[PDB]
Design a protein around this ligand. Structure first.
Ligand SMILES: [Ca+2]
Ligand SMILES: [Ca+2]
Ligand SMILES: [Ca+2]
Lengths: 67, 433
């Protein structure tokens, strides 16, 4: 009965640790990776991955989405 | 790849025109390439066709434990089974994966990356990567633009996988002078909803406009469930699904991009061998755009750009190849003979001066396309609302006039230099009819 959720605009500005709990609550299979905002990455789509892009305070810098 | 080949008409280019990319050299900057050794150990898709294999990210190690780069390069030019679009082109591979798993082998100034590839003979350069900066024009975007204007290298970038929301284009996919590629679906329907309609834009594909309101991506190609070369070092987890020990499935704008890169090699070969010219980057891009197919969403469009690559329509465009430099207030005027009963598509493209990373608009030199029909009806570039000559474009370095039901007679095709502060500015035109 989980609602289909693939983006988390509400997590912008939150800590990485707070973000991870919400994402796992919505998407138990998520493989979460943390990277500095602005990092260059490969552009393949991985349906179970969630990249978190963080600022220098380790707060979520942009909208987390699946892929 | 085998299904994508038919979708983008690479099969028609090959079978009816003999275009497999022979004599062309494509550079791919990506993770690594199979074993990382240009010898008999190399994956069959690339063995014997590697012009250069450079290790940038890890000292003396260009191998591919991830699998991304090997799959990507397979889609450009793999010559075993599940072949790339230009399987007789040779490869320059720049391994940019660092020892921390990222792409830290990229140099701070991307012109360094392009220059190394250019020196090895590559005239096409393809990049299935980006920073997801939501339409920003970054220093990387600026360096791509500066490079393309200075050198006859066609550079392609993935649009990003940050859709379906608007304004999600990654950098350097936001560069004005790159060909930016988004993903439609491959037709492998046994896999379900991601590979069931060749007109569907992949849900993850980044969407325009750019931050300054430009149309990106430029063109689309299949980018879901693409079957291509599997690195001998990569685990199952790197792929969407398995196939065999040598080939597996992946999806992303990462996969659409190299398909188009291969098509560009086929197209470049055609001009060079059969049309008497070395086509400039702007012309290759204009020819792909004019020949592209509306997937059904119409133009203008932030989801499909200018449509899905349809290579056979691009091959024999009537053209201008940067042969008329313009300064402010000058113009170049041409004629084209149309016959009623079939569409007329005219694309103007220039490799603009590099834009500013802080200004409202990235466009520097502003050219306008002005078309006049045999009965006097006027159209200006990118004005798709009637009347078609009142909304002038001052943001894009791609301007199009697409007339579904043209008149018989002489069309005037005019390029006007509205404002060229960094001139002169050359341009290319491609006409499909
Ligand atoms: Ca679909
Ligand atoms: Ca203009
Ligand atoms: Ca109008």
């Amino acid at each position: 009965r989980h609602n289909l959720k693939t983006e988390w605009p509400e997590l912008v500005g939150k800590s990485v640790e707070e973000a991870k709990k919400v994402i796992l609550q919505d998407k138990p299979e998520a493989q979460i990776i943390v990277l500095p905002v602005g990092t260059i990455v490969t552009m393949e789509y991985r349906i179970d991955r969630v990249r978190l892009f963080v600022d220098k305070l380790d707060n979520i810098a942009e909208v987390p989405r699946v892929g | 790849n085998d299904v994508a080949r038919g979708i983008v008409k690479a099969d028609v280019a090959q079978n009816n025109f003999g275009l497999y990319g022979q004599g062309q050299i494509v550079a791919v900057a990506d993770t690594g390439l199979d074993t990382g050794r240009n010898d008999s150990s190399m994956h069959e898709a690339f063995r014997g066709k590697i012009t250069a294999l450079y290790a940038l990210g890890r000292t003396n190690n260009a191998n591919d434990p991830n699998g991304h780069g090997t799959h990507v390069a397979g889609s450009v030019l793999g010559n075993a089974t599940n072949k790339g679009m230009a399987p007789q082109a040779n490869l320059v591979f720049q391994s940019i994966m660092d020892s921390g798993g990222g792409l830290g082998g990229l140099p701070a100034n991307l012109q360094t990356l392009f220059s190394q590839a250019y020196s090895a003979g590559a005239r096409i350069h393809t990049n299935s990567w980006g920073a997801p900066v939501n339409g920003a024009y970054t220093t990387d975007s600026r360096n791509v633009d500066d490079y393309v204007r200075k050198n006859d290298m066609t550079i392609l970038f993935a649009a990003g996988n940050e859709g379906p929301g608007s304004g999600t284009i990654s950098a350097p996919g936001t560069a004005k002078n790159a060909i930016t590629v988004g993903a439609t679906e491959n037709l492998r329907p046994s896999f379900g909803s991601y590979a069931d309609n060749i007109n569907h834009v992949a849900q993850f594909s980044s969407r325009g406009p750019t931050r300054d309101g430009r149309i990106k991506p430029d063109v689309m190609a299949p980018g879901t469930y693409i079957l291509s070369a599997r690195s001998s070092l990569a685990p199952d987890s790197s792929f969407w699904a398995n196939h065999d020990s040598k080939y597996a499935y992946m999806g992303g704008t990462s996969m659409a991009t190299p398909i188009v890169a291969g098509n560009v090699a086929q197209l470049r070969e055609h001009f060079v061998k059969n049309r008497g010219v070395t086509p400039k980057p702007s012309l290759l891009k204009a020819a792909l755009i004019a020949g592209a197919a509306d997937v059904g969403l119409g133009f203008p469009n932030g989801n499909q750009g200018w449509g899905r690559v349809t290579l056979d329509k691009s091959l024999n465009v009537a053209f201008v190849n940067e042969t008329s430099p313009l300064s402010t207030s000058q113009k170049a005027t041409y004629s084209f003979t149309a016959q009623a009963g079939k569409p007329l598509k005219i694309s103007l493209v220039w490799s603009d001066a590099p834009g500013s990373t802080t200004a409202s608009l990235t466009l520097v030199n502003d050219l306008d396309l002005v078309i006049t029909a045999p009965n006097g009806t006027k159209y200006v570039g990118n004005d798709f609302t009637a009347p078609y000559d009142n909304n002038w474009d001052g943001r894009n370095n791609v301007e199009n006039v697409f007339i579904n039901a043209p008149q018989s007679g002489t069309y005037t095709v005019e390029v006007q230099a509205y404002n060229v502060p960094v001139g002169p500015q050359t341009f290319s035109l491609a006409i499909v009819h």
